[PDB]
Amino acid sequence: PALISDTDQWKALQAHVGAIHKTHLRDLMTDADRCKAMTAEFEGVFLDYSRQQATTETVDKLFKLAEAAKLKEKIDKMFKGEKINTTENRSVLHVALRAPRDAVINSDGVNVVPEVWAVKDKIKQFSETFRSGSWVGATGKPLTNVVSVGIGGSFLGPLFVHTALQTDPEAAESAKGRQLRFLANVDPVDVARSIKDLDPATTLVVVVSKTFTTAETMLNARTIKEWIVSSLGPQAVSKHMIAVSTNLKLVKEFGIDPNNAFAFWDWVGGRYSVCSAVGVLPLSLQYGFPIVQKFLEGASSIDNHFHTSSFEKNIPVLLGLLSVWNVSFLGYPARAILPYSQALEKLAPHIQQLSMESNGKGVSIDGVRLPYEAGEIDFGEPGTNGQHSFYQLIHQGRVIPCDFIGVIKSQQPVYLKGETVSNHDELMSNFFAQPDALAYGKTPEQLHSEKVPENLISHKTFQGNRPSLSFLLSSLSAYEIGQLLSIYEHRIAVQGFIWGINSFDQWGVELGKSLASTVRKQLHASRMEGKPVEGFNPSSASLLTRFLAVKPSTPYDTTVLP
Amino acid sequence: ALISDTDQWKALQAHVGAIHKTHLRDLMTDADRCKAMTAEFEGVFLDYSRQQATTETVDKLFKLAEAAKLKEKIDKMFKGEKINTTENRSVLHVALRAPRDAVINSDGVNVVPEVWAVKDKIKQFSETFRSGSWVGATGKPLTNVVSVGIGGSFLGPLFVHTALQTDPEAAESAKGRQLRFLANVDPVDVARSIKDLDPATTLVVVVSKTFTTAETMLNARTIKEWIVSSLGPQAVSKHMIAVSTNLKLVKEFGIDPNNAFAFWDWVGGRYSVCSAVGVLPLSLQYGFPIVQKFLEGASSIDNHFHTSSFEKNIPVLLGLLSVWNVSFLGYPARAILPYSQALEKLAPHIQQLSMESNGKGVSIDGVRLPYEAGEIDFGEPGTNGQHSFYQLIHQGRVIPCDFIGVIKSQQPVYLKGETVSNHDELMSNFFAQPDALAYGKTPEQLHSEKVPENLISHKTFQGNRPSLSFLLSSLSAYEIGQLLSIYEHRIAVQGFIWGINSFDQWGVELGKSLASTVRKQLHASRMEGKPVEGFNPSSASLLTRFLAVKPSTPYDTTVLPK
């Protein structure tokens, strides 16, 4: 009912902002008790948020907001499989994808776990038949190269986990001599990329789309399918392509054997689908189902933590509340995902979808237009790369609250005899310094104390008091990757719950699809039928006229591949 | 003075109220307006009609450009004046792509002869290198090049290289060759860069303006050890070369002095890809002529930017529109949305080019700014980003978009009987998304479509969200160079209007200082058993948790990855 911004709690936090404005992190970060309070910890995951612009009172005030917004009830309702995605009338149960074989989670009156495990075991059997060479090509060779075709939550989530497992010793071993490539873009350049240095006879294709109607994926699906027939023949399709989708009737009609189709469900959000067959199938072909099952158990471990742990100890809850604090009360429109791991390189792009597609919303879940903005702009690059890209602005331009992620045990440790510190230790020294640099700044007195020329002190000042939080992880293997993923899936839902919006819908994408089909029809009529450009505004008409002024080089209606 | 105090600024400020009384879905019917809010140069067409503005808005920006002496600052830049007042340096990345006869003076000395001297040196080496004549220690010719560097020594080259990888001319000149980038100090990135590489057939290029950047030098000494450990300590003068401003330090590293390639203090890191920073590794992958066509692309914009009147001046218009969106419409972020997979690494370079130049808190005179300046930049290629964060751009926070599309596909693909070619399928998104953000979709339309009254609010698009569009004739080396040059000059324009130094980077120092202090602590604790001391309580604990885990390798013993 009531907009959260109307509640006394919400206004109580707005009064609190003026009090925090009177404080500076240079002083707050000497308080042992404050800084010890503003931590939390679960297994290999340590979270230090002492560098937020916050006191324990802020956190206490944030907790009564969470009660006033009924955060605990909303979390249980999700876990209980209630249809909280009200605008699509759907359950929201990514957690059921990693729930234990004995769990009971009902959607639409049926327990969905036994069917969740139905797919897992089918993927396991296929994965063993695949990796052991008994699944052969048309020229009889065993397949070693997998192209996953998909976009959005059918792409970014799996890419993230694949890039994180690539350099973990255990997984890397299990994936010896095997490739996993992702065809996402419809740009035919991406198509050329994903098939470069590849053999149709040795390549398996997996088509991932919750719908099997998505325009870019299905054209990719049809394009790569022809690459296979060009080189192997019309029957090769059955042994060289498989699919993951909610709608298997559409998979049958695409020409894929119905027993080579691995299902997931409409209560699996796209941007929450990596734990479903979307990611488990392709990751299991690369790293084997043992490695992937570890990733699931990690994710499952945070699901239990998020569902049952009190709010002072609850990492997803703390993260989401501090994010609302930064966004809606301190007014920070962006947020930086800065992990000190090249293995986590593809983490920010996935958080981008998960975060902005969930909470880039203008109305409450009941349809009331929000009087405030919800949904931060997420970006990042891994440290230390980002340090030499944009941290200049983070220190001296617009204030951007940061997520620092560091890992203790290196995946690929390096030391040279005589070096002051190991390579991984060099990396981590910035991980420990940057958040303190952001908190304390450097005063002009401190600069003039160091005989810095007066004309430069202005340019060398750091204001400090810029906020940050630090994850410190035990290691970065499949289990922990899954824990990281679960922590952000649940953090985004918490921001959405506090904001009182539908984190789990995506209507903002419908208009671009409509107009693109209107343009597509204009492009067919002009290319194939020579029909003028008609029905567009004068800018669009000129641009289309420029585009179509370049007539194709290919003989009419003739197939061309790279 | 201070730009925010001038009448031109206050006029533009009230002008916002008039623009707020318009809506793009009307403004876009005006053929006079749409035609006027464009600009064009060679195969580069700019349509900015979808900006929240009129020709009068642009008129008023021009009078701000006048009060700001924009024309002047561009001329001083081009003439070689040391406009980088805080470091007392010229700003002459223009001179890297100048012709031999050009007269560009820094400190009374013409710099062009030295520019072309390095250039001629690179070409000579790249013929030698690519011919196979240059061999390794085992006598085999060198196939693969690894480029070690960070930030400016990294991002521009990576962008240009990703773009050329699929260009059919460049790809042909690059066959059989690899060019990889080692950038992070994270030893995972070392393991990745040397994965499947043989040091016998590998050449290493060390790029750093200072040759003292901690991450690059450790990676450099790390990859040196990789080479000596396989091919002997003599193999170094054969397998390692360097790019930098300091050659004494390059000799000290242990690299043959005539295997050093200079550039100069008036080349910013984020403006350095047209120097040997980019020209050298790119010439090795693609041949020097391909790289020469890129430099010529950059050069054409330089002349266009320097001479063209403001209403035809593409970088001037871009920079003023971006200032308009930032300082008057209030938009904190900007999206780089190339509808090209080959431009996949464009946005990461623009992040650095823009946010390090313009993320500043004081004027070029050290006056504190009463408004904020440099915007947060980010992007993904279309249509990828479409299925990631566009939900927010349509229905959440407003984010001005740069859309970039290309007429001719680098990699055209067509299937007989498909309604459109794959590149045309890509482009109908490129043409639809701007219109969809400009027009919106009202509840009235939705009710007129029999959308249930309870779903109308969730499916509403407000429209009047700004975007601009670039249409490129092709994406060959020449056009990549033009795109590069457009953005370098746009960012400068913005800094000039704002009155800030787009060319220093003091905001990075404080993180460097405290990271040294951490590096000292880690050595003291790893090698000397010293306790943790001199950190705040949060940092003390984080460091103890990290040191708790001892490395599994014997003391002072060299370990490499995989």
Ligand SMILES: O=P(O)(O)OC[C@H]1O[C@H](O)[C@H](O)[C@@H](O)[C@@H]1O
């Ligand atoms: O999984 P698909 O049916 O292929 O749909 C692909 C989808 O990826 C994500 O889920 C996004 O939310 C959508 O913007 C996109 O349409």
Ligand SMILES: O=P(O)(O)OC[C@H]1O[C@H](O)[C@H](O)[C@@H](O)[C@@H]1O
């Ligand atoms: O170019 P280098 O000497 O390696 O310097 C690396 C540099 O990255 C960018 O170019 C920036 O100028 C700094 O953030 C950093 O110092």
